[model samples]
Target: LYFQGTFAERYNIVCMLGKGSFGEVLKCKDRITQQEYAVKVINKASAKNKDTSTILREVELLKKLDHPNIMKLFEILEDSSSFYIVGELYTGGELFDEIIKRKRFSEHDAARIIKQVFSGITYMHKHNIVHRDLKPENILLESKEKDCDIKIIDFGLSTCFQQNDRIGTAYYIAPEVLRGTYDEKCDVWSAGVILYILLSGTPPFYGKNEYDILKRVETGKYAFDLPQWRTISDDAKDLIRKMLTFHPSLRITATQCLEHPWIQKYSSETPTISDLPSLESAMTNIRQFQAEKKLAQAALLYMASKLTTLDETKQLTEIFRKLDTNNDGMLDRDELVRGYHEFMRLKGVDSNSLIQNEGSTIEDQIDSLMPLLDMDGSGSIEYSEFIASAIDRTILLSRERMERAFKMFDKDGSGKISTKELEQVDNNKDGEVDFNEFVEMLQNFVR
Candidate 1:
């Protein structure tokens, strides 16, 4: 439904990222929101054989998916010449390149990465969709750092969504897939192949050429004879065998893969990082925060998702996990009170007799802040709310993020952003944004 306006009217092409017979995928910045996205420009002339309904079904399915490990479909624009599919841009290079660069990954690191792919696949299978294409090149990292998050893409767009039209990559496709009949188990097989490559730095089916690879892959000829397997864990090898079983009915499911004892033991623990100083900075920013309107508050919450790099907010996210001690994923009043005390202790101060108690106490203090932080009025703080409230204004208020927030609160697309409507009773000017400044930044090409 949002497939409106010429691609040029809303986006400025930055550079080419990939090329295919269908078209080229390019990096582009949204003209209005100032956000960067990888836009897939499918040439209608080159793709004359494919119908629009097939492509729309694929993109439309991608639009409603809501999982952290999955790539987000932000907008879709089409004209007489081509279709522009915009989504989150990941410049960390393909998982193939990463494996080649690092040589191989340890069991702990490989399990951590595989767990994310399992989570994403679980989410997709629940939605009744399958990524028939599951190769290292299709899984991308959110950042170029250790422990970066993965985003799965290409929901069989190269093939038709309903037809299951083409065979997947030779080295990754399962035995049942080679028989031209399969289920979601096909993706599990591909991930198992990736897990194999990730550990041994070589494919499970090592063949001299593409035809040899397909023949070996069809026969299910794989084993762990590499010297590295002598050092690898038995449990890890057991899980790989289950995922790559010859029969589709005997193969492990994504949900089962996540529940494997090896995965639970290695990948479930949240590692600690120093965030006391960064948490203090975030707390100070909150004391003078100006997003009073629910509209404005949600916009900031969205910024916490799209704007900041995973590494920049690594500290905040770590402290968040630390604060939620029970791993319940929600902060109750007791948790908040404890969090408040933790904040004060870091500063060599007591929680009590600190703030001016003119009209409120500590619980009252959290209650006052609760209205802004408890975005959905669920009587507790959510993960996104805590991230939004505790975010550093310096990182969250970049022109691109702020301008994107502007688009959400202002629907007309041409009217002035109602900045004052949310600024009343805000009491501080530290993070106060001026709508007039957006006009200037959009013109100056400012950072």
Candidate 2:
């Protein structure tokens, strides 16, 4: 009753949602807002320094992030001894448990779930945040249905740094995580593991004991040996291999994973792959590779925020806020790509390379330019960096920049701007405009 009273002054505790090792979540109703939310209560005394730091960090990131796939935090109530974190109420429950309840599961079902998960992770990585712990238990559904929207929860082990100490579940943890030097790519590995389970109904790494299980995970080997695997597609297996690559850099990014053929096929609006045959492969090659290269190689670590003032900082923040329509505090690949594509289109610049490949429809030009915008290789651009690069910095608009920019507009790499190109860019009815006119027009176009 006393614990209930803690949040009861403002909220009505509907019921106990669940309990974890460090805290208990209660489904509560807001008296004023008249909305239902889940409140996580953690005792200050029971938490260690590291645990407290983790809690604080989780709160810090959640407050800034605004995405549909991520659980929203509305309020934080603090007394002398406890922290009450009020957030969205998900009545559906965990993902894996839902999978278990299903009488039958299909590849289409798995693709849908994995798409939402990657969408959230993509937003997170774009903000330079890593959900270090991304197991199925932490993935909650909005309703008790197979097709219900999912929310990614539990950010206690998440971080914004490029390099951090290892922290994640044994089964979902990346190889670099165990070695203690990993980046946001670590999350990719976990997602791959999740995808593996979703497709096969079992973990890729399993053993009789904890030691043995970790050993398998460290070996970076998994197989499609089960009979059910015969029904899965080769594209799915290729994606799994891509995401579960032993090297962190080699691991597929959240955006790349979303662009995978298997994901693209099933997640399409019409869903046309039902009648296709499954192409599962043998496990012998994977096993042989694992046996040959079993040791986990340790790698290097080198690393590196925020707002204020109505000047550039404030203006930049506003620009970032506008670009970051989701208000996730960072420009995700999609957001940045959209902005870049629009920017390029307005400037009469060729965007063919940014989105088009010979055989593919609008590919990941965002993935290619992320490194240019993302100075630290954190996989996303922060608001501060984004502002500098976008506002004061002319990443593609100086005199020399204009020449390169002009070539893109020229279309066929013509030494001079053509009448056809000038017709598109010419604000006035002048047949020929000088380079100054071009730059001035470029400035106006960008604005």
Candidate 3:
């Protein structure tokens, strides 16, 4: 989406970080400040299929978060045709993926990671944002002067609840989320799953799909089964038991996690890094690649192993294409805005409706997308550009870079974008959008 426009002026694309069901991950650069960052680019197709509510919940939760351990959001940008989420570029790698490279983690080893995770959870609770998808993959690490630090990422399954609301990842989800009732304690249940993975190198529950996993979580029909279960520390088991409790009120809290005897003893001695040489090297190499572009090929090879499916590649490709709207192989502000608007529309969203809440129409949706078109450097929409957006990150957005994006989308060299150029890319001239039509058109734009 950005490639066709001006993002190249602000940032350069590094190798992809990951490809989710809906988006592709990329390392980006801030041209003026000369700083590096990661951008998760999602296309309209994936957002619509996935439900905008999920994305909104994640954005809402991340926006309110301010903690040392929780992943931070820098800025958010959108328009008629696309969406971009820029965030702090973490490089330590996923713990579950690390476990595959290493063997079982010692109690002390797990404690260090768990402690940081608990701290992140504590922050989320304070902000009324619950991380429903607390898993090894979600816990990320970043470079540090002392040692690698953990930062929790991915709030896709999270939600802000009033009293109680059900939400969580399938395997690590609490019983309450599975049963469609949950509170802050549900996070503890996820912590229990992490604890199980740490102690036994496996989850307490298992199933084939989301439904099967939910059933196992809800029924608690499975027991902790491991030869080493006998050798597992009683204190550790006790903490897990308290967290895994089916009752919400009975579930352990973040404060309680710190107080656990195992945590107290184990946190300090945990290894500074995982033992796996390949995984550690891979992480180091990727970080190096982000900081410097020379190792791009090596980084690509390493990521290939983590992504085992072609489906993921397809998603990544689509996300890249959206960023490269002109097929010019570079991104700019205009492309980003177009991508953002398209993404929102795919989700059945009309930005104007958020305020007006009434008298919304297909035309209004078109108008909403247009404002992001950003025809000139003013960073606002012109009527003609609005006609085009008919096409937009987390983290500190560089004003310098955004202006470049705007300049790139104004393809006419007139310093202004025309509605006709956008119409050519619109693929359909119906002027009115049906939900299905929007989704179909959107998927093509994203990976």
Better model by TM-score: candidate 1 vs candidate 3: 1
lDDT of 3 by residue, 234-283 (tens): 88888888888877876778768756777767543211222233223322
TM value for model 2: 0.56
Q: Candidate 2 clashing pairs?
A: none
lDDT of 3 at 224: 60
Weakest ten-residue segment in model 1 by summed lDDT: 159-168
| Candidates sorted by lDDT, best first | 1, 2, 3
Which pairs of residues have clashing backbones in candidate 1?
none
- Stretches of candidate 2 exceeding 4 Å from the true structure: 1-8, 48-58, 157-169, 270-447
If candidate 1 were superposed on the true structure by all CA atoms, what would the RMSD be? 7.1
Off by over 4 Å in 1: 1-6, 31-35, 45-61, 64-66, 156-168, 271-273, 277-293, 302-314, 317-389, 393-395, 398-401, 407-447
**Comparing 1 and 2 by TM-score, which wins?**
1
Residue 117 CA error for candidate 1 (Å)? 2.1
Instruction: Write the number of the candidate with greater lDDT, choosing between 1 and 3.
Output: 1
What is candidate 2's lDDT per residue for 22-76, written digit by digit as tens? Answer: 5788888756444577888777676534555665766766765655578767656
Give the per-residue lDDT digits (tens) of candidate 1, residues 1-447: 254455776689989898752567799987866667888777676664568887787677776565557777766778988788888888787787889888999998888788878878887887787888788888898777667768887774655322212333677888787778657999899999999999889999877777888888888879999889999999999999999898888889988887788887774443223556776776775665533455456656666765555556666666665565433335677777777777667667766665664455667777778777776677767555777777765566666666665555454454344444333222234443345554443323211
